[PDB]
Design a protein around this ligand. Sequence first.
Ligand SMILES: CC(=O)Nc1ccc2cncc(NC(=O)Cc3cccc(Cl)c3)c2c1
Ligand SMILES: [Cl-]
Lengths: 305, 296
Amino acid sequence: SGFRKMAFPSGKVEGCMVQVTCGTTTLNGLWLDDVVYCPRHVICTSEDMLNPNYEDLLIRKSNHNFLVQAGNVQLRVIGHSMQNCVLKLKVDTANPKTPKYKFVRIQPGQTFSVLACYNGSPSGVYQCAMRPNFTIKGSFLNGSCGSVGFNIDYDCVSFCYMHHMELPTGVHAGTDLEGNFYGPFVDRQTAQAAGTDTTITVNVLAWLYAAVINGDRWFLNRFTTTLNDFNLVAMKYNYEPLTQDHVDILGPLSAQTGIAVLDMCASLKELLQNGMNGRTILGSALLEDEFTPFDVVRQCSGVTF
Amino acid sequence: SGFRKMAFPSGKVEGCMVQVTCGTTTLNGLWLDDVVYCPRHVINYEDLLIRKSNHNFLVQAGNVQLRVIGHSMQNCVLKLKVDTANPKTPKYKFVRIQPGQTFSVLACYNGSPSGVYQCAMRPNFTIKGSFLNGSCGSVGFNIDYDCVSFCYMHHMELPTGVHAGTDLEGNFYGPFVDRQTAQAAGTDTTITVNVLAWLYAAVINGDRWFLNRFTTTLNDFNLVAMKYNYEPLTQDHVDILGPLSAQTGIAVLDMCASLKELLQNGMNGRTILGSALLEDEFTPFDVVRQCSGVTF
Ligand SMILES: CC(=O)Nc1ccc2cncc(NC(=O)Cc3cccc(Cl)c3)c2c1
Ligand SMILES: [Cl-]
């Protein structure tokens, strides 16, 4: 019993964290085999960030301008290249702690664990989701750049995020491990603002099924809804549209509890209308959207209470 | 910016997790040097233990079978002497925590870590964890510098869904016993010093709507807090909040007057750090650490 925001064990990622220094800037790098991946803005000054020409800044650099530190050992850089917004530093030593891994690009609504690092040293781990506006509501201070997001399914680490910047509202933006940003963001200091955010409807529904699995049904009602009527109501509360794919994905949880997706949609509609009336669901007074249908199946029991 | 329930990096503990089987029961063990620590309920415990030999205990570390060469009991923990020292043993200490203190939990099943989360020892000595059958032997810890301080080992789930366990010396937290009997968690209370720390974290992150011009006395605050099932606030708690009071310019009894107003009026449709409830699972030290950048 119980329901917590659980992160994946971070050990496999901790053994890949390194410190990258270029001139006066120091940030984090990910060391996999003989390559260190880090944000390309490590080659920039603060002045450069207004309109940086990365190709022009990089051509003026040699291998020995990049200092890479793994624990107490200095790694020697023997090559460098840029791939989108990521700098790839070829080093002379392969990481003996390299786990089985893949680089995966996630979609909004997907969750992942973040290992927050400073000076190549891991300080904490937390779970979060890629928001519909492509930002992440993280907890990052200056020096956290290069910190990574990941999932561990079985013994394989799937890297999905690398931290690049904080936006004026305090939310965070970054790239996949191939250097492609999530969202319409650039690694430039410009008027960049996160778009209006919305609630991840399929995740709220999954969390309502998790509450039913853990023995709580006070929020159910005797109504059903069409998918269109649900979406017309949900969009008024800034909820993401629920698609037929989302209904298909909730199928297993619907069969485990005996509550049709559209009947759970009717209960969500009523919750938006009435609020909680002093009650909580899984210890929360807000509707939670950072648990996917997959996370609920992973964490919760296969037997409903 | 941002404020998350953050756990310590779990790598140092992951390298200590093993699977312990005794007959039909399978649970988790902690392998430090040549000793495996696990709940004694894996097996009248003295009478059950005397009938066991070393070969009755099967210990599995990854894909390798460890050979048990001795066994002894210390309170509610079984200590299995194995023939191999753990080469991944970190620098460690066994410490007993107090209610209100927080720690990270590495939840395991069959000796394999599945997740990590942060939680607090409640005033009623239970933990609001997330554990399924097979999680027994999962451990709680903090990391200070490069040293892992083990503070909790999971033993059982209570009828309300909350969890109970021991320190690593086998002493239960709370009035619980390791057996099937009518055991219920006492009425819980809110960890006041932690709620205050989280209010200071909200001010640091730019949330001041709850701040007011008023200040209170410690006695008046405690008379009000006792009415809402909040733990009494002591002079030690006021002293401990000193650094956060100096950083934001809000005296502790100044923040107590804000908390008193939130207790009598609620939030009025507003949130603090994305929450509609007053959060009590962040200590003053956790707030200072997450708003500073301490690494391990
Ligand atoms: C003093 C300061 O920079 N504070 C914070 C606070 C919090 C921060 C959290 N994450 C990242 C930071 N770093 C950046 O945003 C550097 C950067 C600037 C301009 C564009 C880009 Cl692509 C990257 C943070 C920086
Ligand atoms: Cl995805």
